[PDB]
Design an enzyme around this catalytic site. Structure first.
Site, PDB file in Angstrom:
ATOM      1  N   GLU A  47      74.639  39.863 -17.260  1.00 48.59           N
ATOM      2  CA  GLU A  47      73.393  39.419 -17.865  1.00 48.59           C
ATOM      3  C   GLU A  47      72.446  40.586 -18.103  1.00 48.59           C
ATOM      4  OE1 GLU A  47      70.249  37.652 -15.747  1.00 48.59           O
ATOM      5  OE2 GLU A  47      70.176  35.863 -17.045  1.00 48.59           O
TER       6      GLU A  47
ATOM      7  N   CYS B  52      60.903  33.908 -16.813  1.00 49.22           N
ATOM      8  CA  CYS B  52      60.600  33.734 -15.406  1.00 49.22           C
ATOM      9  C   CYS B  52      60.222  35.060 -14.766  1.00 49.22           C
ATOM     10  CB  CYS B  52      61.817  33.143 -14.704  1.00 49.22           C
ATOM     11  SG  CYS B  52      61.354  32.008 -13.446  1.00 49.22           S
TER      12      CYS B  52
HETATM   13  O1  LIG Z   1      65.437  33.953 -13.190  1.00 50.61           O
HETATM   14  C1  LIG Z   1      65.051  32.868 -12.732  1.00 50.61           C
HETATM   15  C2  LIG Z   1      64.858  31.761 -13.563  1.00 50.61           C
HETATM   16  C3  LIG Z   1      64.423  30.554 -13.016  1.00 50.61           C
HETATM   17  N1  LIG Z   1      64.176  30.453 -11.669  1.00 50.61           N
HETATM   18  C4  LIG Z   1      63.748  29.138 -11.135  1.00 50.61           C
HETATM   19  C5  LIG Z   1      62.276  28.976 -10.778  1.00 50.61           C
HETATM   20  C6  LIG Z   1      62.052  27.504 -11.105  1.00 50.61           C
HETATM   21  O2  LIG Z   1      62.474  26.673 -10.029  1.00 50.61           O
HETATM   22  C7  LIG Z   1      62.984  27.244 -12.276  1.00 50.61           C
HETATM   23  C8  LIG Z   1      62.318  27.451 -13.635  1.00 50.61           C
HETATM   24  O3  LIG Z   1      61.416  26.381 -13.780  1.00 50.61           O
HETATM   25  P1  LIG Z   1      59.922  26.564 -14.366  1.00 50.61           P
HETATM   26  O4  LIG Z   1      59.066  27.379 -13.422  1.00 50.61           O
HETATM   27  O5  LIG Z   1      59.989  27.247 -15.712  1.00 50.61           O
HETATM   28  O6  LIG Z   1      59.361  25.168 -14.467  1.00 50.61           O
HETATM   29  O7  LIG Z   1      64.033  28.172 -12.130  1.00 50.61           O
HETATM   30  C9  LIG Z   1      64.372  31.549 -10.834  1.00 50.61           C
HETATM   31  O8  LIG Z   1      64.164  31.481  -9.613  1.00 50.61           O
HETATM   32  N2  LIG Z   1      64.806  32.744 -11.378  1.00 50.61           N
END
Ligand SMILES: O=c1ccn([C@H]2C[C@H](O)[C@@H](COP(=O)(O)O)O2)c(=O)[nH]1
Ligand SMILES: NC(=O)C1=CN([C@@H]2O[C@H](COP(=O)(O)OP(=O)(O)OC[C@H]3O[C@@H](n4cnc5c(N)ncnc54)[C@H](OP(=O)(O)O)[C@@H]3O)[C@@H](O)[C@H]2O)C=CC1
Ligand SMILES: NC(=O)C1=CN([C@@H]2O[C@H](COP(=O)(O)OP(=O)(O)OC[C@H]3O[C@@H](n4cnc5c(N)ncnc54)[C@H](OP(=O)(O)O)[C@@H]3O)[C@@H](O)[C@H]2O)C=CC1
Ligand SMILES: O=c1ccn([C@H]2C[C@H](O)[C@@H](COP(=O)(O)O)O2)c(=O)[nH]1
Ligand SMILES: CCc1nc(N)nc(N)c1-c1ccc(Cl)cc1
Ligand SMILES: CCc1nc(N)nc(N)c1-c1ccc(Cl)cc1
Lengths: 560, 558
Positions: free
Chosen positions: B333, B441
């Site tokens: 990735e 994120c």
């Molecule tokens: O690289 C990443 C991408 C996502 N998340 C997690 C955080 C959240 O639980 C969810 C994304 O949800 P939102 O915060 O966008 O609602 O995925 C991570 O920990 N790391």
């Protein structure tokens, strides 16, 4: 021989009463603190009846309501020449397991009575006012500790706590060899038996400074001062600790050597309980000086820097406007409203007396930025322009941008009002496509909001570069102020500002001034009130006249 | 016995300690310092007529020792042997002034009695320093209160092994083999009582250090303590003055604590130097103190706001060990990001499916992107990194020269003006958010160089699933820091993780509590291969990395 302490609440000018009452509206946490300290038996705090004694003057006894006096669950001693013990008992029926109230003719008689008649029953002795008895106890030298509630606001008073050695804990004192005479003060004997001898002078030094509390619009904190001479400077099994010690010793060898080389800077080391939240800021300064790396920077001056630092400040009782050096409040407020307006004309700040942007928008400086087409004062598509119009094409500071770009601030406020658990409530000023059009690349470049289960709002701001001496206090107040404003128009309660720092540095030419500032004990934080709350519905409604700072008592200018 | 006995050893995860009467690995410098400091220091100096410690070894260990180090200086040396003669050892190399004659004893109990008897006033601590024959005797006698074990994270060919012992699960995963009573040494708890069913001991960690390395070998230090196996399923005036005030100030938190059963990772470890304790402590602090709410999907999330962790990169690599991290996914990735690629099919066709659930026709339609081809993430992470601000049409378009290439800008600044305070890369573009399958994120990272050419990186993440996403995110940006450091001729120092909404899902809490029972293992090393070929960030491929010594715990049953 029993310990004697003083317990008192006072304004910065030592005010303690008026018309035989307290000067201020009721301070709820202070009343709990007074009760807990004076009622707690010594074995309890460290985790046949034994009780404490409270000693007071006649006016203090008279100042209490009949239903409230004597103070429950403590032996009460009144110092008075006119009050009679039988009258006091005759006021109302005596409760069960309550000590009979004693009346003595002086403080020495009261202490002697407690030492002798109450030898097996009284644990601790508290002098609880008023100024007559405080003065007596100070001049006698019998008080090992003073429990002072520093009320940060001033109030009309006609009774004052006596001036005392150590009262610079309350307010700024002309002491830089500029006083007209030695400060007025009670002489406090270090050894009470030896009275007033030059060799026997004591002072009170702070060992404890709590965070700031408030009730009824009054900010205040709690300090404990300990008597000193004026001529003064987890847990584990022992076998586990001994097995571990040789490995820790070699692991710490490189750090111990560099500690023993330099002198370690430490803010007000005599304060052992460092609850005041400004200790984060003072400890940060010390850690950069002690453990940062000296390096070169854009301005040529030279810095000591660390990378990746955090602080957090509570917003629910008081406001973190720092007190060991005054913060330019008018600049913080005027600049923040300017940001909110999306304004990029720094002359609008300068004409109000806020000059902080001027050196970076001169014809000379804007030409160093290869922006000779910029009119003087035009900061380019910087902070507030990106907040209100992210991504819009920038012409100049006079152009109307309504409806261009993304209005992040409006989006954040709308999300907080409708979906406060959303995890994308962010506002950014860092637009890499626009960086070269700006007078300065944004420094505080990202903030994020969060709401908990009780409608409390918190804010994180990320700052790429942080001058801890001068910029950081200003940025703490800006984003704390923003959090109060956002909370109000979203019907939330402001809870916490969280500060994330990238390049965190002090300038080497400021090191000596910062060492002097690190000798100052923080004062209680003020309150920031929003005025005319019914009028203000939207973030754009705030004006510069909608705020008041209450109880701000900072230290003065740095003598360096 | 009035004198303490400890075992000092270094071993691979398979308990290997030796080959060909030598050590199995290249020289481990820090372990050699640790060995000298532990066995030499007398507790007057550790806590802070000559007193010294004794070191006791078998004949083969004595013979293995390079003659320039033998006898071990400043310590009494005792060799357990039926053939060596004290006179021969003394004549081979007579002792300097104020050093101790080397003694020879016929057994470990003979060696320990000689020490208690003849060296009553002079010997402080006793260390058994090898090899397998003497370690086994000491374990079976039960005289060792502590084991100082250097956990070498790589397997090396060995012909001599440390004995299987109660507590050796600290080294590696234990299969379904039961075998242990026939295999493990029985360790008496009370050495006088010997092998009785009621006298069984085990060794439990009280100390786990951060990971070190030398010569391409990662390793760490643990101290284990003997326990019963049935344990398993300022001035007082200042302090007294302050106590009543603290009592009332803490009353609220005290009365909530008394009602909660506090979670705590592996609480018997008292010194918690291993950097993975930040992650384990964070899980615990979220469960103890986070606020339970509901999120997008209606499930429970326990959350805190504003958290940080820091991971050293100069000796080992923070690939977490209490649960395996999907390394291939991390690396593929990141390479994909660095390409500015937005076609998630390119990942899926390499066996990396982490994006698929968010690029399906069904999901994309829920983003009101019905015109997005399946697999198209929109103008997301690596597109913003390499083409910030560019307008996005589709994942097939060529965007060369469009937008701001922040990654190239950051590298050029590190190469030319490293003290610059503007070396940032952002994925948070509010103008492009609605065109992305997922709002980013991990959205901002910033670089820094100290006065020693050491590089550090901060990454800011708005939303952190601590259970599942965060270990992956830690590896992603540590790896990015290693790659950036190399192409800039810098040394990687530290990865700093700033976290916004930091949470665990309430239906993971049970599996997380199991994870918190696992002691972290030493971190592996990540090596960049073919360094001479790699000059620019775009030059790296998947074949250019190897993960060395990665020994994670196995899958969670919950
Ligand atoms: O690289 C990443 C991408 C996502 N998340 C997690 C955080 C959240 O639980 C969810 C994304 O949800 P939102 O915060 O966008 O609602 O995925 C991570 O920990 N790391
Ligand atoms: N903010 C705070 O923490 C506190 C505030 N207060 C405020 O302080 C004010 C009252 O304090 P104050 O006005 O100073 O009066 P006091 O409570 O000190 O009572 C004064 C009287 O007590 C006796 N007395 C006091 N000192 C001596 C002495 N040294 N030797 C002998 N007798 C003595 C005399 O009684 P007689 O005339 O009977 O001989 C004197 O008139 C009120 O406004 C009250 O609300 C009170 C307590 C604490
Ligand atoms: N990685 C590490 O931390 C360490 C590794 N090593 C490696 O371990 C290997 C050597 O260990 P090992 O091969 O087990 O040999 P040892 O060092 O255990 O020496 C074995 C000999 O010591 C004597 N001996 C040992 N145990 C007893 C006993 N219980 N009672 C009486 N005499 C005893 C006998 O000597 P005799 O035959 O003279 O009677 C026996 O033959 C080498 O490869 C060395 O490099 C060594 C130490 C530490
Ligand atoms: O809000 C601000 C703006 C600037 N600075 C400081 C950080 C640096 O010392 C200097 C900005 O210059 P650079 O970081 O761009 O080099 O001003 C702050 O502390 N706070
Ligand atoms: C709660 C007010 C208070 N707070 C503090 N910190 N100290 C005190 N000595 C008092 C006090 C004032 C008047 C009376 Cl009558 C009794 C006590
Ligand atoms: C430094 C190697 C080492 N490290 C540790 N942690 N323990 C040891 N017991 C040894 C060791 C190996 C061989 C000999 Cl001969 C002596 C000591």
């Amino acid at each position: 021989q029993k310990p004697v302490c003083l317990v008192v609440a006072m304004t910065p000018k030592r005010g303690i009463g008026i018309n035989n009452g307290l000067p201020w509206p009721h301070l709820t946490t202070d009343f709990k603190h007074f009760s807990r300290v004076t009622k707690t038996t010594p074995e309890e705090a460290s985790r046949g009846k034994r009780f404490n004694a409270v000693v007071m003057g006649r006016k203090t006894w008279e100042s209490m309501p009949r239903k409230f006096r004597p103070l429950v669950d403590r032996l009460n001693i009144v110092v008075s020449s006119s009050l009679k013990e039988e009258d006091i008992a005759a006021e109302k029926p005596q409760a069960e397991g309550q000590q009979r109230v004693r009346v003595c003719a002086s403080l020495p008689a009261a202490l002697s009575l407690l030492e002798e008649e109450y030898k097996d029953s009284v644990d601790q002795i508290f002098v609880v006012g008023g100024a007559g008895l405080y003065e007596a106890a100070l001049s006698l030298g019998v008080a090992s500790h003073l429990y002072i509630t520093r009320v940060a606001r001033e109030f009309p008073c006609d009774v004052f706590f006596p001036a005392f050695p150590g009262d610079d804990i309350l307010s700024n004192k002309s002491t830089a060899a500029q006083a007209a005479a030695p400060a007025e003060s009670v002489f406090v004997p270090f050894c009470p038996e030896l009275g007033r001898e030059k060799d026997n002078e004591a002072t009170y030094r702070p060992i404890f400074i709590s965070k700031t509390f408030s009730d009824n619009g009054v900010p205040y904190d709690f300090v404990v001062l300990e008597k000193r001479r004026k001529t003064d400077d987890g847990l584990q099994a022992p076998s586990s600790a001994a097995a571990i010690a040789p490995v820790l010793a070699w692991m710490d060898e490189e750090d111990r050597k560099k500690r023993e080389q330099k002198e370690l800077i430490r803010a007000v080391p005599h304060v052992h309980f460092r609850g005041h939240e400004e200790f984060q800021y003072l400890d940060l300064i010390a850690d950069i000086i002690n453990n940062g790396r000296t390096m070169d920077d854009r301005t040529g001056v030279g810095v000591i820097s660390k990378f990746g630092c955090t602080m957090r400040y509570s917003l629910d009782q008081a406001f973190p406007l720092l007190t060991t050096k005054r913060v330019f409040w008018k600049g913080v407020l005027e600049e923040l409203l300017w940001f909110i307006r999306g304004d990029t004309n720094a002359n609008h700040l300068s004409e109000k007396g806020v000059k902080i942007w001027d050196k970076n928008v001169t014809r000379e400086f804007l030409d160093s930025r290869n922006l000779p087409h910029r009119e003087v004062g035009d900061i380019g598509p910087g902070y507030g322009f990106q907040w209100r119009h992210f991504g819009a094409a920038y012409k100049d500071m006079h152009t109307d941008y309504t409806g261009q770009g993304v209005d992040q601030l409006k989006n954040v406020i709308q999300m907080l009002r409708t979906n406060p658990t959303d995890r994308r409530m962010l506002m950014t000023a860092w637009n890499p496509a626009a960086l070269d059009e700006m007078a300065l690349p944004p420094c505080h470049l990202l903030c994020q909001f969060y709401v908990n289960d009780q409608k409390e709002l918190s804010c994180i701001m990320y700052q790429r570069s942080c001058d801890v001496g001068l910029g950081v206090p200003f940025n703490i107040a800006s984003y704390s102020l923003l959090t109060l404003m956002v909370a109000h128009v979203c019907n939330l309660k402001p809870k916490e500002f969280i500060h994330f720092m990238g390049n965190t540095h002090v300038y080497t030419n400021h090191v000596e001034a910062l060492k002097e500032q690190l000798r100052r004990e923080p004062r209680p934080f003020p309150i920031v009130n929003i005025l005319n709350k019914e009028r203000i519905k939207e973030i754009d409604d705030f004006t510069a006249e909608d705020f008041e700072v209450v109880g701000y008592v900072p230290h003065g200018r740095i003598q360096m």
